[PDB]
């Protein structure tokens, strides 16, 4: 969880998503199926999200 | 005795003719340079040697960061506190009816010449 | 410059974490079987 | 060896003899309406009984030595015999320069300094490089530090890879102490007490109560809250110079909440802006500027080319300059840059004990250090390759 700083899907092989919190930023690689949920929730950079790992 | 201001009748706004758009920019620009200004409430030499310094390589002019990612925040400008409102004419921001009153009486439209 | 000796160690650490979690999840997502399963229902389901 | 360590900045003149001098001087002249006709140069401001309403004659504008006469008078005086004695002949001088001095300005400097003071090398160098030398001295292992020059009218985020100012990822930002002070001046007077002429007294207040509120929004809320508490508590009793010489903050126990004092003191000041000014230093776009706060520019720099470097980059953050003195500056700056730096990548935000003299301390060490009698450049060599030798070395 964090503020999403960027989303880039890479037919989509995966999606890279950047997440920010008060203790720094981390670049995540996300399973492309998850990339459906992101569009369903209308997430875009500057939103705060809680993508659950399992 | 009399109300003693009908003689001077300064504003008498039947013909007010608002100042807007580019004029706002002028005001903004003015304020910026005033905050950038100096003792009096050589700059021409600074501008001259700066216009000597114009080039595409890494230099004074090309060292400017630019616009910020974090968007601009509102502030009141009369007391400096966060301001939900904007003045319809000049676009300057404020946070109460009282602050709009003071602004309309001293800073709205009066210093745009 | 150079590379931080601790930075590469941390990268190794979290790569190991990442792979162990691929194992955990790929096992957990295939751990139990259907009560019937698709071909049983296909065989039973009449026109 | 002995060197005229120079810090010719618009507001500060940390010139020394390489012998524990750390002398700040006004790189400016003053005209006091009270003191009839006298262009008080450098520390002569202390001769002024009433420094109210002083007209500042500044050699620098946006920090670019201009009019040259102010700086001349100042320099001469500094040397003089009363301040630093008449000692030129071999007493080589070390000079600081704005990151991107407009050639002609300090090129003419080079000339004057040499063929108008005539004494062993000038070794003119950006203050940031001197502070970088000092940092690397006390931080041998470290690689690249920012000379975060939160100074008078300037604030630069700068790559320094081992005494190598990368003139590509240097963010000069803007809005330094000078601005902050003037902005306060307006705010103060327009709100109350149209005293926006005294400058220096308001500056006292500017570095007497002003601070970097940790939570700007929360702090705001409290400060703009009726009754007691509400943080507030400034009531800076500015001196009229007929009563006192420097203003001071009234103790919280003596503050009259009604604002009506019986003592005849100039008893205004209402707080709040205390954190706003430093906030402007950090949180930009409020005043109107479009540049991003120093934390942002720091991170920006770190993301330069050398991906391996970036880690060391923030692990060597050096908040230097004047503005850095602002209470909370260090912690605020860290907090932001850390929340912007990659988690794994460790962020180390430090601050020199005196980020004002740090430059002079460095330059002094460098003077004592060798490879300075080497490298170098003076009239001796200036007598052959004009200024080409100079710029070649600097």
From Swiss-Prot, chain A:
The record's comment on protein family reads: Belongs to the RuvB family.
Protein name per the record: RuvB-like 1
| Domain statement | Binding to MYC is dependent on a Myc domain essential for oncogenic activity.
**Other comments on record:** High level of autoantibodies against RUVBL1 are detected in sera of patients with autoimmune diseases such as polymyositis/dermatomyosistis and autoimmune hepatitis.
The subunit field of the Swiss-Prot or TrEMBL record says: Forms homohexameric rings. Can form a dodecamer with RUVBL2 made of two stacked hexameric rings; however, even though RUVBL1 and RUVBL2 are present in equimolar ratio, the oligomeric status of each hexamer is not known. Oligomerization may regulate binding to nucleic acids and conversely, binding to nucleic acids may affect the dodecameric assembly. Interaction of the complex with DHX34 results in conformational changes of the N-terminus of the RUVBL2 subunits, resulting in loss of nucleotide binding ability and ATP hydrolysis of the complex. (Microbial infection) Interacts with Mumps L polymerase; this interaction regulates the viral transcription.
Q: Which domain of life is it from?
A: Eukaryota
Tell me the compartments it is located in.
Nucleus matrix; Nucleus, Nucleoplasm; Cytoplasm; Membrane
Q: In which tissues is it expressed?
A: Ubiquitously expressed with high expression in heart, skeletal muscle and testis.
**Taxonomic source organism:** Homo sapiens (Human)
- Whichever gene encodes this chain, its name is RUVBL1
Curated annotation (Swiss-Prot), chain B:
UniProt modification remark: Phosphorylated on Thr by MAPK11 or MAPK14. Phosphorylation is required for MYOG induction, for deposition of histone H2AZ1 at the MYOG promoter and for SRCAP complex integrity.
Modified sites of kind Phosphothreonine: 62
**InterPro entries under this entry?**
Vps71/ZNHIT1, Znf_HIT
> So where does Zn(2+) 1 get bound?
76, 79, 95, 99
Q: Where in the cell is it found?
A: Nucleus
* Expression (tissue specificity): Expressed abundantly in liver, but weakly in skeletal muscle, ovary and small intestine.
Biological processes, Gene Ontology terms? calcium ion homeostasis; chromatin remodeling; heart process; hematopoietic stem cell homeostasis; intestinal stem cell homeostasis; muscle cell differentiation; negative regulation of G0 to G1 transition; negative regulation of transcription by RNA polymerase II
Q: Which residues cross the membrane?
A: none
Q: Which domain of life is it from?
A: Eukaryota
Zinc finger spans (HIT-type) are 76-108
Role summary: Plays a role in chromatin remodeling by promoting the incorporation of histone variant H2AZ1/H2A.Z into the genome to regulate gene expression. Promotes SRCAP complex-mediated deposition of histone variant H2AZ1 to lymphoid fate regulator genes, enhancing lymphoid lineage commitment. Recruited to the promoter of the transcriptional activator MYOG at the early stages of muscle differentiation where it mediates binding of histone H2AZ1 to chromatin and induces muscle-specific gene expression.
Q: What is this protein called?
A: Zinc finger HIT domain-containing protein 1
Instruction: Name the species this protein comes from.
Output: Homo sapiens
Starting at the broadest rank, the lineage of the source organism is: Eukaryota, Metazoa, Chordata, Craniata, Vertebrata
UniProtKB/Swiss-Prot annotation, chain C:
| Record-annotated disulphide pairs | none
Q: Which residues form the signal peptide?
A: none
Q: Which compartments does it reside in?
A: Nucleus
Source species, domain of life: Eukaryota
Q: Which disease is it linked to?
A: Floating-Harbor syndrome: A rare genetic disorder characterized by proportionate short stature, delayed bone age, delayed speech development, and typical facial features. The face is triangular with deep-set eyes, long eyelashes, bulbous nose, wide columella, short philtrum, and thin lips. Developmental delay, hypotonia, musculoskeletal defects, and behavioral abnormalities: An autosomal dominant disorder characterized by developmental delay, speech delay, mild to severe intellectual disability, hypotonia, musculoskeletal features, and behavioral abnormalities including autistic features. Skeletal anomalies include joint hypermobility, chronic musculoskeletal pain, scoliosis, and pectus defects. Affected individuals also have non-specific and variable dysmorphic facial features.
Can you tell me which family this protein belongs to?
Answer: Belongs to the SNF2/RAD54 helicase family. SWR1 subfamily.
According to its UniProt entry, the function of this protein is described as: Catalytic component of the SRCAP complex which mediates the ATP-dependent exchange of histone H2AZ/H2B dimers for nucleosomal H2A/H2B, leading to transcriptional regulation of selected genes by chromatin remodeling. Acts as a coactivator for CREB-mediated transcription, steroid receptor-mediated transcription, and Notch-mediated transcription.
Q: What name does UniProt use for this protein?
A: Helicase SRCAP
Please give the organism: Homo sapiens (Human)
UniProtKB/Swiss-Prot annotation, chain D:
Q: Which InterPro entries is this protein grouped with?
A: Actin, ATPase_NBD
Main location per UniProt? cytoplasm
What is its biological role? Required for formation and/or maintenance of proper nucleolar structure and function. Plays a dual role in the regulation of ribosomal DNA (rDNA) transcription. In the presence of high glucose, maintains active rDNA transcription through H2A.Z deposition and under glucose starvation, is required for the repression of rDNA transcription, and this function may be independent of H2A.Z.
MF terms per GO, please? nucleosome binding
The record's subunit annotation is: Component of the chromatin-remodeling SRCAP complex composed of at least SRCAP, DMAP1, RUVBL1, RUVBL2, ACTL6A, YEATS4, ACTR6 and ZNHIT1. Interacts with CBX1, CBX3 and CBX5.
Q: Which PANTHER family match?
A: ACTIN
Report the subcellular localization: Cytoplasm, Cytoskeleton; Nucleus; Nucleus, Nucleolus
Positions bearing N6-acetyllysine: 260
The name on file for this protein is Actin-related protein 6
Q: Name one GO biological process term.
A: regulation of DNA-templated transcription
Sorted alphabetically, the Gene Ontology cellular component annotations on this record are: cytoplasm; cytoskeleton; nucleolus; nucleosome; nucleus; Swr1 complex
User: Which residues, renumbered to this chain, carry the PTM N-acetylthreonine?
Assistant: 2
Q: Per the similarity annotation, which family is this?
A: Belongs to the actin family. ARP6 subfamily.
What UniProt keywords apply to this chain's record, in alphabetical order? Acetylation, Activator, Cytoplasm, Cytoskeleton, Nucleus, Repressor, Transcription, Transcription regulation
State the organism named in the record: Homo sapiens
């Amino acid at each position: 969880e964090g503020e999403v700083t960027e989303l880039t899907p890479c037919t989509i092989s995966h999606v890279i998503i950047g997440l920010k919190t008060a203790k720094g930023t981390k670049q995540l690689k996300l399973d492309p199926s998850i990339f459906e949920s992101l569009q369903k929730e209308r997430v875009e950079a500057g939103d705060v999200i809680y993508i659950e790992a399992n | 005795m009399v109300e003693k201001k009908t003689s001077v009748r300064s504003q008498d706004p039947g013909q007010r003719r608002v100042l807007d758009r580019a004029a706002r920019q002028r005001r903004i620009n003015r304020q910026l340079e005033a905050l950038e200004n100096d003792n009096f409430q050589n700059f021409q030499a600074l501008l001259e040697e700066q216009n000597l310094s114009v080039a595409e390589g890494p230099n004074y002019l090309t060292a400017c960061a630019g616009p910020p990612s974090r968007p601009q925040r509102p502030f009141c400008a009369v007391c400096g506190f966060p301001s939900p409102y904007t003045c319809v004419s000049c676009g300057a921001r404020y946070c109460t009816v009282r602050c709009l009153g003071t602004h309309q009486e001293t800073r709205c439209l009066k210093w745009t010449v | 410059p150079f590379y931080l000796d601790s930075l590469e160690e941390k990268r190794k650490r979290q790569r190991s974490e990442r792979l162990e979690r691929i194992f955990q999840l790929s096992e957990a997502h295939g751990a139990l079987a259907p009560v019937y399963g698709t071909e049983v229902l296909d065989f039973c389901t009449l026109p | 060896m002995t060197t005229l360590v120079l810090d010719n900045g618009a507001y500060n003149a940390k010139i020394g003899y390489s012998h524990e001098n750390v002398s700040v001087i006004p790189n400016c002249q003053f005209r006091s309406k009270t003191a009839r006709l006298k262009t008080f140069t450098a520390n002569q401001i202390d001769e002024i009984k009433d420094p109210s309403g002083l007209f500042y004659i500044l050699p620098f504008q946006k920090g670019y030595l201009v009019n040259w006469d102010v700086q001349r008078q100042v320099w001469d005086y500094l040397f003089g015999k009363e301040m630093y004695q008449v000692d030129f002949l071999d007493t080589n001088i070390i000079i600081t320069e704005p990151y991107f001095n407009f050639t002609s300005i300090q090129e003419s400097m080079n000339e004057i300094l040499f063929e108008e003071y005539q004494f062993q090398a000038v070794l003119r160098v950006n203050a940031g490089a001197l502070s970088a030398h000092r940092y690397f001295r006390d931080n041998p292992s470290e690689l690249c530090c920012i000379i975060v020059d939160s100074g008078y009218s300037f604030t630069h985020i700068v790559p320094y890879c081992r005494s190598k100012k990368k003139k590509e990822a240097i963010i000069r930002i803007n809005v330094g102490g000078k601005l902050l002070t003037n902005h306060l001046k307006e705010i103060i007077s327009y709100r109350q007490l149209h005293v926006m002429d005294e400058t220096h007294v308001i500056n006292q207040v500017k570095e007497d109560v002003c601070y970097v509120s940790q939570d700007f929004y929360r702090d705001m809320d409290i400060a703009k809250l009726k009754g007691e508490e509400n943080t507030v508590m400034i009531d800076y009793v500015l001196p009229d110079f007929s009563t006192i010489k420097k203003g001071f903050c009234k103790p919280r126990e003596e503050m009259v909440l009604s604002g009506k004092y019986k003592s005849g003191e100039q008893i205004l000041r209402l707080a709040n802006e205390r954190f706003a000014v430093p906030e402007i230093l950090f949180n930009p776009s409020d005043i109107g500027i479009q540049e991003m706060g120093i934390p942002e520019a720091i991170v920006y720099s770190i993301q330069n080319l050398p991906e391996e470097m970036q880690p060391h980059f923030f692990k060597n953050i050096v908040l230097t300059g004047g503005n850095s003195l602002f209470p909370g500056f260090r912690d605020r700056v860290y907090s932001e840059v850390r929340c912007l730096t990659p988690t794994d990548y460790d962020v180390s935000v430090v601050l020199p004990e005196n980020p004002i003299t740090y430059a002079w301390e460095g330059g002094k060490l460098i003077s004592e250090n060798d490879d300075f009698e080497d490298m170098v450049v003076t009239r001796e060599d200036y007598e052959e390759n004009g200024h080409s030798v100079c710029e070649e070395k600097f």
